[PDB]
Design a protein around this nucleic acid. Structure first.
Lengths: 94, 271, 46
RNA sequence: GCUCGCCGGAAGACCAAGGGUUCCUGUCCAACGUUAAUCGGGGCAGGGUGAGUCGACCCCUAAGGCGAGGCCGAAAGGCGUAGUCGAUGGGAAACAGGUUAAUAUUCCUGUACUUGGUGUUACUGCGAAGGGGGGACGGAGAAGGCUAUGUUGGCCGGGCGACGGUUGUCCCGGUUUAAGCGUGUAGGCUGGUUUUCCAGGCAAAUCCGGAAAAUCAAGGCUGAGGCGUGAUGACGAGGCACUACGGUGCUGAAGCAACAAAUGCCCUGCUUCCAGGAAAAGCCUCUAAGCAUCAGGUAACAUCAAAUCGUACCCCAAACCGACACGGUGGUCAGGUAGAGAAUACCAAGGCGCUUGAGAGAACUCGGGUGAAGGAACUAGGCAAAAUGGUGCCGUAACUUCGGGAGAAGGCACGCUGAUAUGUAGGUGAGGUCCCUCGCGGAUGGAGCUGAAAUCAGUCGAAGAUACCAGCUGGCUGCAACUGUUUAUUAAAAACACAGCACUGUGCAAACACGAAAGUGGACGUAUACGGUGUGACGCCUCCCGGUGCCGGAAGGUUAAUU
RNA sequence: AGGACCGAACCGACUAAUGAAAAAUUAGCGGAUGACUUGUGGCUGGGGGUGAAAGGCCAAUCAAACCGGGAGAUAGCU
C-alpha cells in the first residue's frame, strides 16, 4: 500500500524517443522518467492509479548524467531513472 | 627402515628416506584435526621475531592427547599415523567407552595393543601412571613437570627419560640432555620410549627438502656488511672478532640461562 | 614496463579513503588540515 | 566497389581490473590528429545501458582488520575476549531462437527452473546460541569411457565452365537445434536390514561412536555421456515480392551415418608418493529448555514474491599503467592442411595495411643476400657471422659417486609410383544369429569406415629430414659439488644459498626476538627439538691456551651504595 | 621417480648490433613439476622494515624514503 501523495511524486514525465515510440507501438510498453528513489512496485502503483491502466511488469534503469562543458567550465548533468512499463494486452494509453 | 635413494639425479643422490610401512595410508581422524596456519616466524607486531621460518607445506593440527586422563578405561590402538607437526608418530586409540584420541606412539606399540592410564594400570609400554607408582630405573616419556598439566619432557621421535631416584614428594629424572631434574612425584608419565627412533637417520639430500619443511635459508653474518651483522664487512674474507649473535651477544660458549625461579629443581646441569 | 601506479579502487579506498582517515587520530588531523586549507576533494573518495 | 598485401594460440572473439560516455545518429572542421581531411576516440546536439535465475548486494567464513568489558601504557595509545567485519574461497534457480542505429542468458517468442511466504485440505512431535554428519579439499601418474570439435561418405539444393579437357570416382554450398523433464549407462564408493546394551560426543538424545546378537547377499549413495522427449516447433542453402539501395516482408530442401578426437567432462574418481594437503555457513540429522491437543513440522494445491544497485563502450589497448593516438597488463574461447605440438609455415572465421606522401636510385649509416682463391692470417678474445640441426637403425672412449659420461664421437636410410595387400598389421564396429535376472544387457559375428610401419621393384631431380622449423663437435685445465639466488637501470660470478659437517647456547613461563608494558612469535614445538655461529655434496683427512675472548674456581689483595 | 632431459606458453636477462622507450630492440640465450610461476586481498615503516646478502629493495628517490615543520639551520667558501 503506497500513499497517494507519494505516488503522485513518483512519476516525472513520459520519455519521447524513437526506441520509446517503438516500444509503445509494438510491445505495449511505455517509457517514463521517474524519481530516482522510486522503486518498481511504487512506479507500477503510480501507473495504475494515475493513468488508469493495468500493468504487466516494470523494468527500470538508471541513466547516468553526461559531462558537458559550458564554455571553459566543466559540469555534469543529473542522473535519472527510466522505466519501461509493460501494459497488459489490449490496454490503450492516452 | 632407512632407505638410501639411488642417484638418478643430483639432489636425489644423497637422500635417505625413513619409510615406515605400518603408518596409516589414508586421511587422518577428522574430528581430532584442526586448522593451523603458518606464522612466517612473525609476531603480532608483524615483525620477524625468529629468522629462517617460512613457507613449507600446509599442515593440519592433530590434537594429540598429552594430558592422558582417561583413567581406568582401557584403550586399544587402532592405527599409527603420520603427524606432520612433530618428529614422533601418533597413534589413534579407541577407548572401550567409544571415545578416540591421538597419543604419541611409543617404541613397541602397534595396532591391537591395549593401553591404560591410571594409578592401577599395568607397568607396560604405552601405559600411563603417576611417577610415584612407576618403579625407579624405568624409562618413561611424555613426562609432566606440573601435576595435571600435560606431558612436556620427552616427546621427540626417540626420546625417553630415566627415573633415577624417588626421594619423598619428588623424583629425579635424567633428562635426554643429561640434566638431572627434580619433579613432583604425583606428575604423570607414559611407560617406555617414544616411537620413531630412526627419524635422525633421515637426510634431506637437497635444498628443496629443507624448504618443504618451512625452513628459509640462513645467511652467514660474515657474508654481510657491517651495518647488518657484527661480523660483516672486510675486503675478501675477514673475521677478526669474537663470534656473536646478530645482536652482538657471544655465541660460542656464553651461557644464557637466567631463570632463578627454577634453579632449585635442577639437580645437575647437562655437560 | 610495469610502472609504479597499478590502480585498484578497493585498495585505494582502504588505504586512503574517508573512513580509513576517520579511523585514526592522525588521519582525522590530516582531514582537518585539508578542511582548513579549503580543499574541494577532502579525500580520495569519489 | 574490385584487385593486392598482413595477422590468424592473433594484430580474431568474450570478460575481469582500470577507465567512465570513448557506444549509436545527425552535424561542424577554428583547435586537437606529428601532413590533408569531407574523416575521427576532436567540437556541438540528440539518443542509448530493461534481469526472481548473469554479477554485486545477501548468508558463510580465510589471511587479516576493528574490538564492549578486560589487561597494559606519562598523554596520545598498545594488545586482546565476547563479538563484529573481511574474498581471492563455500552457499537456490534459464535455456534456445528473433530483434535495435546503438541493450540483451535483461526486450520479444517458445519451452523451463528456484525459495520464500500467505491460504489449504491431509497428517501429527515440533523445538537451539547446543550434539553428530556433511560441506571438506595435496602433488604426481595412469589409463579407460566420453563429448566439444573435425574429416569423409551419404542426402539435399545449385552448377556443366572466359583457355585444352570436365554428365562424372566431377565442382560449390548446406546438412544446425539448447536448458529442462524422463531414463540412471561406462564407471567409482561402501556390505545392508533389524534387535539389545554402553564410564564417550560439557546436559539430553530415537543421531553419531563403541560393544554384542540375529538374518539377507543385494542395499544404498555417486555418475559423464548416450537415448527419448523438448521439437507437427525453431533455425536453415538460398529462391521470391518491395526498395529511402541501408534493407524490409513472404518462403524454405535436406537436416543422416561412419571414422577420428582433446589439455574439456566422468574425475572432489582411481593408483601412488611424502613434503601429509583451509574455515564456516547453507544442507541432513539428534535432542534440550520449552509448548501440549495450539503452534510448528511434510503433503500436495492455489495464489502472491523475489526489492535494490551494475548492465553502453574500450579491455594485450589510440579508451587501463607508461606526460603523447608512445613497453607493461589476469582469466576464458582455440577451425583447416602439414606437424610430436598451444612450435613453425600457409589459410578460415574475423580483423587489419600500423594518419605524412611523391620521386630519385650518390657518399655514408642501418637491416639483409651472394661471393674467385685462401680459411682465424682478423682480434684482447673466432666478437659477429658461417656451420651443426629431424625420425629410425647401426655404433659409441677415457673417467665414474656405477646413475652416468652419452644425442659422446661417427655413420647409413629418407621423395614420388606400383606391387606385396583393387588398403596390409592394427583400431573401430552395423546388420544377421543365439542367450537373457530384459536392458543404455551379454555372446557370436564380421559388413562398412579408418589405417600406420616395412620390404621388393620402378622412377624424377644437382639435391627427398628439400621450405619454415631444427644440437656445432672433440681434447687439456682453474673455480664452485649439483638445481637454485643476486647489484630493478654498466658486475650473474669464483659472490649468496644449498644438502652435509662441527661448535655453542637453550629443561620449557626454554634460549632468543619484537614490544616502557600487556602480550606475541619461538611452538599449540619439548633436546632425534629450537636458537646462534662458522664450514659447505662425496672421498681421504683435519703442534701452540703466552695474547684477546668464553667456561669453571674462589683462598688472598683491591673494591660501590650503605653505615 | 626426478629441485631428471629436449622444448612452446610463462618467468628470466648471458652475447650482439641498434630514443619508438627516463633501460627498449631485433637476432640468438637460461629456467620451464619447482628452492617454479601468477591473479586477488592481507601484514611488516625509516636507524625502522625486508634482504638465498648486492648496502639490494622500501612508489623513475636510498650508507638511512617522502611530506610538512624547527628554518631565513650554519657557510672563515663561490
Amino acid at each position: 500500500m503506497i500513499r497517494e501523495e507519494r505516488l503522485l511524486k513518483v512519476l516525472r514525465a513520459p520519455h519521447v524517443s524513437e526506441k520509446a515510440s517503438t516500444a509503445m507501438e509494438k510491445s505495449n510498453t511505455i517509457v517514463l522518467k521517474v524519481a530516482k528513489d522510486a522503486t518498481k512496485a511504487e512506479i507500477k502503483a503510480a501507473v495504475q492509479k494515475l493513468f488508469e491502466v493495468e500493468v504487466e511488469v516494470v523494468n527500470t534503469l538508471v541513466v547516468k548524467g553526461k559531462v558537458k562543458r559550458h564554455g571553459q567550465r566543466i559540469g555534469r548533468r543529473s542522473d535519472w531513472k527510466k522505466a519501461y512499463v509493460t501494459l497488459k494486452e489490449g490496454q490503450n494509453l492516452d | 627402515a632407512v632407505v638410501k635413494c639411488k642417484p638418478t639425479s643430483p639432489g636425489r643422490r644423497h637422500v635417505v628416506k625413513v619409510v615406515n610401512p605400518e603408518l596409516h595410508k589414508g586421511k587422518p581422524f577428522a574430528p581430532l584435526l584442526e586448522k593451523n596456519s603458518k606464522s612466517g616466524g612473525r609476531n603480532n607486531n608483524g615483525r620477524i621475531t625468529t629468522r629462517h621460518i617460512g613457507g613449507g607445506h600446509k599442515q593440519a593440527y592433530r590434537i594429540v592427547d598429552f594430558k592422558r586422563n582417561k583413567d581406568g578405561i582401557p584403550a586399544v590402538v587402532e592405527r599409527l599415523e603420520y603427524d606432520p607437526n612433530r618428529s614422533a608418530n601418533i597413534a589413534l586409540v579407541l577407548y572401550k567407552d567409544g571415545e578416540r584420541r591421538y597419543i604419541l606412539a611409543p617404541k613397541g606399540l602397534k595396532a591391537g595393543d591395549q593401553i591404560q592410564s591410571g594409578v592401577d594400570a599395568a607397568i607396560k609400554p604405552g601405559n600411563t601412571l603417576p611417577m610415584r607408582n612407576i618403579p625407579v630405573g624405568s624409562t618413561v616419556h611424555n613426562v609432566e613437570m606440573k601435576p595435571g598439566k600435560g606431558g612436556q619432557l620427552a616427546r621427540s621421535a626417540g626420546t625417553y627419560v630415566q627415573i633415577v631416584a624417588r626421594d619423598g614428594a619428588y623424583v629425579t629424572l635424567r633428562l635426554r640432555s643429561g640434566e638431572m631434574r627434580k619433579v613432583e612425584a604425583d606428575c604423570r608419565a607414559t611407560l617406555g620410549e617414544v616411537g620413531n627412533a630412526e627419524h635422525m637417520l633421515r637426510v634431506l639430500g637437497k635444498a628443496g627438502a629443507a624448504r618443504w619443511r618451512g625452513v628459509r635459508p640462513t645467511v652467514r653474518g660474515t657474508a654481510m656488511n657491517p651495518v647488518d651483522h657484527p661480523h660483516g664487512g672486510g675486503e675478501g674474507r675477514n673475521f677478526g672478532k669474537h663470534p656473536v649473535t646478530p645482536w652482538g651477544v657471544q655465541t660460542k660458549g656464553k651461557k644464557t640461562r637466567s631463570n632463578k625461579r627454577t634453579d632449585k629443581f635442577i639437580v645437575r646441569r647437562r655437560s | 614496463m610495469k610502472r609504479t601506479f597499478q590502480p585498484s579502487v578497493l585498495k585505494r579506498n582502504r588505504s586512503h579513503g574517508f573512513r580509513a582517515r576517520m579511523a585514526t587520530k592522525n588521519g582525522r588531523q590530516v582531514l582537518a588540515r585539508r578542511r582548513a586549507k579549503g580543499r574541494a576533494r577532502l579525500t580520495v573518495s569519489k
